[PDB]
Design a protein around this ligand. Structure first.
Ligand SMILES: NC(=O)c1ccc[n+]([C@@H]2O[C@H](COP(=O)([O-])OP(=O)(O)OC[C@H]3O[C@@H](n4cnc5c(N)ncnc54)[C@H](O)[C@@H]3O)[C@@H](O)[C@H]2O)c1
Ligand SMILES: NC(=O)c1ccc[n+]([C@@H]2O[C@H](COP(=O)([O-])OP(=O)(O)OC[C@H]3O[C@@H](n4cnc5c(N)ncnc54)[C@H](O)[C@@H]3O)[C@@H](O)[C@H]2O)c1
Ligand SMILES: [Mg+2]
Lengths: 310, 310
């Protein structure tokens, strides 16, 4: 039915996570039909209320029969692959099963089911220690952690698919229900009057609204396929983030501390090919990105369970 | 210098040739193999040799093998590759299998783990001969899963050597251009050579570096194993023609390489020479000729054992 001429039946793996739930909140009010598959390893049941147009299967992308049955009953036109394992750096076996084998399973099931477009999200950890920052899209993959090695292979399998695939390599995305990293940490700590420390690292940040716009473009028939960096292309230090929080919240000068052994000095993506090929560009700058995150904390707390669905 | 060696994939070409080299020296050897491609004939019931039939994907089986056998050394030679559409098997054997082998070896406190890597990990190289610090950029099921496998092994606390190998020739090689030209030329069938360049390594040179790799105090990490010289498939053909003594009814056509066929894959072994002091001794003509001489004696067979069975 609606939206007229472009109703999607969207199968979203990992739909109970941050990105998944934010996409559901974006698409469901438009009339799209959504099916989520999640094992609740990190995602939350509370972000998936029993509303019309939304179904939820508690299961794993590693379970290939659960997937064939779900693709067969639901008949999606589109797939968003957002399921990932990462929480235990030493559980290589779970990373490989979810991130490699689960990607392969989704790919095979999508191809059989005839889906029009498949959207995957890739961690910038795929680049490992880059030689060039901002990282060009044609830079090699060079992961050196369980999460990066497994995601790298996952993406590589997906790119062999006969289904048109977009894999978005992502900046640190901010928005509703983000509850980890420097933004919430500096916010809670500064309100608690606790000592903060800034890693001596450059990172990039993307506002949820800009993430949503490229996700929309990525699922349109006829649009480009392949791997794409999604960023403003600007990098900001952890200290710069801290400074925005401090001023926002209104509290000895903060020490610049690290970086840890496995911490890459600078990770900032070059989005130039994505601008060219999609005509997309990130509209929300750094200050507004962090500020809107902090504004969300003021209203709902540092929580990962506040649903904007009725 | 007595070794208790656990060899996964020991029924295959490299594994079985290793066993023939090491078992006469008094080493105790356990093989784990699922016989996907390796043959039961190459592993006779002799003193010093144990065979468990099973998969590196089976974490339970592996734990029980490492516990009972207590290896001092591990040679990880198991790989899946035969069906390029069977991504799930490639990922299970090559990624999960490598992870199970790494974890089990770590737990059992092995002195040294030896891995073999396909040059498909390099994808389409930017520089030939391929430097050892070149990126991994695989684009096939076999190259992707093996790349991930090796990367997981490199995260082990056990000392690891991973050898990126030229095309190894020796007893029981029954695939590739060498046996194909030998058989076809003797039968009067038309041959064609792809216009590609490759490297070839005699078994004797392979045994030498494998030996060095298993010795305490030796270097660790990734290494290219090669003469460092490349030869076209036409050059291989030419050696086979002359050796077989055939007369051609038309010149061999040299044809443009396939879609997925990398034009030139030759490895630069300099770091291996620097750190190991190893250098490949057998030149191209002698390497090809030694393969053809083996076929003259035994035929193109992968079931002839050089071990003396009771
Ligand atoms: N949020 C970011 O800024 C960011 C940056 C780079 C890449 N990514 C990628 O985007 C995707 C979503 O990230 P997120 O930030 O929303 O994280 P998230 O932890 O909130 O993950 C999404 C979900 O995956 C689920 N999951 C894990 N294993 C599963 C399994 N085997 N079967 C089904 N579901 C499973 C979790 O329960 C979770 O809800 C991931 O692939 C991640 O690697 C995110
Ligand atoms: N021979 C070469 O020139 C060459 C070149 C580069 C890399 N390598 C690497 O060297 C290693 C051995 O190669 P090969 O030429 O001997 O090939 P091979 O096919 O003869 O041997 C691989 C062996 O692994 C076994 N196997 C497959 N899946 C298994 C599983 N799940 N559990 C246990 N065993 C399993 C097969 O039965 C087979 O005996 C492989 O890792 C390969 O990728 C070989
Ligand atoms: Mg092989």
């Amino acid at each position: 039915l609606v939206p007229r001429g472009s109703h999607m039946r969207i199968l979203i793996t990992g739909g109970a996570g941050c990105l998944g739930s934010n996409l559901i909140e974006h698409w469901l009010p438009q009339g799209h039909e959504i099916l989520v598959i999640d094992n609740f390893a990190t995602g939350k049941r509370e972000v998936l209320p029993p509303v019309a147009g939304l179904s939820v299967i508690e299961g794993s992308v590693t379970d290939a029969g659960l997937l064939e049955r779900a693709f067969d009953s639901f008949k999606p036109t589109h797939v968003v692959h957002s399921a990932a394992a990462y929480k235990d750096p030493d559980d290589w076996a779970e990373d490989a099963a979810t991130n490699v084998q689960g990607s392969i399973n989704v790919a095979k099931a999508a191809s059989k089911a005839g889906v029009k477009r498949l959207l995957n999200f890739q961690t910038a950890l795929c680049y490992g220690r880059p030689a060039t920052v901002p990282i060009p899209i044609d830079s090699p993959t060079a992961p050196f952690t369980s999460y990066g090695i497994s995601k790298t292979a996952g993406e590589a399998f997906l790119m062999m698919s006969d289904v048109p695939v977009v894999s978005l390599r992502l900046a640190n995305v901010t928005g509703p229900r983000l509850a980890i990293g420097p933004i919430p940490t500096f916010y809670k700590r500064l309100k608690a009057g606790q000592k903060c420390f800034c890693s001596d690292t450059v990172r990039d940040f993307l506002d949820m609204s800009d993430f949503l716009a490229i996700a929309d473009l990525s699922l349109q028939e006829g649009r480009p396929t392949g791997v794409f960096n999604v960023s403003t292309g600007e990098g900001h230090s952890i200290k710069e983030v801290f400074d925005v929080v401090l001023d926002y919240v209104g509290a000895e000068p903060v020490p610049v501390v690290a970086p840890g052994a496995d911490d890459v000095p600078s990770v900032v993506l070059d989005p130039s090919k994505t601008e060219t090929e999609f005509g997309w560009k990130a509209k929300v700058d750094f200050k507004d990105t962090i500020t809107g995150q902090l504004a969300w904390y003021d209203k709902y707390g540092v929580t990962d369970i506040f649903s904007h669905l009725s």
